[PDB]
């Protein structure tokens, strides 16, 4: 029975959280894991506080040959617009990435602004205030939100570009997926962006989006798996899954990421991580479709494997995996 620590993402909080409980019920294992956004876990694992940490946003090749890290992919998940709209059921609202980008900008005011109208044609708007919400905290959300604004609308990438952290123009800060769904709950004609199972699970009303082929699209499990059909995982884990090409591909998609040491100082520790993350790849693909995840491809566990098998080791260089 061992006892083990992450650290990070809220995006893939909900998933984590069930298979540890699970794997708690089978094996007797405990894994605890803190939600603290994707920055934090970054800066908690170059710590040495946790047996893991979670980032979304990926960490390049050469930062982690300087770190002394490797990382590895889980699940695939969407971020979504949950909305607090006065006389509209979810899945109503249409909005494309240009008038998105606009609306955080603070150009768009109202819902029934002509160009959410002009989206929307056959919807009554009310004349409700928007109320922008953005994270707080050092976020991987934030950044494959910002990544997405900055390939729709120019001003955005020109003005306030792409980042963990950004200067926002407008919006109110949630802390966590869990701050933002709190926020979009309590304030009538909020907009802010979530994980998807953070709308769901809250009863929260999100927005369909425009592809990158021009057609709305639902925001599905099936619909974050068809943006990333795409991708050649061969080549790199660090793919980008945003305003990805085809039928019905979610826009805002993104996988995300378990950092580790590669030399093992507590071999121990890190050979029951693995073992963690290995059962969750052969049995927890039930309970993360359950919470709207897809599940990486065979192919991706695969790779994972055989990369743990390569670059895992105690400090006297003997593999974890």
Sequence with gaps: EASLTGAGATFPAPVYAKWADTYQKETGNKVNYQGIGSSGGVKQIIANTVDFGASDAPLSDEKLAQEGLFQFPTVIGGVVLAVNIPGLKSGELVLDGKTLGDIYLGKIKKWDDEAIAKLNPGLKLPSQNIAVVRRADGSGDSFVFTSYLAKVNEEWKNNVGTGSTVKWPIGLGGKGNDGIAAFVQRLPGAIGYVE????????????????????????????FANAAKGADWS?????????????????????????????????????????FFDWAYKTGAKQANDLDYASLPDSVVEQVRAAWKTNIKDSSGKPLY
């Design 196 to 223: 998807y199972a953070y709308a769901k699970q809250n009863n929260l009303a999100y927005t369909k989006l425009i592809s990158a082929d021009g057609k709305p699209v639902s925001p599905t499990e099936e619909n």
């Design 235 to 275: 080549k790199t884990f660090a793919q980008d899954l945003t305003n990805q090409k085809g039928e019905d591909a979610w826009p805002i998609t993104s996988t995300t990421f378990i950092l580790i040491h590669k030399d093992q100082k507590k071999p121990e520790q890190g050979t029951e991580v693995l073992k």
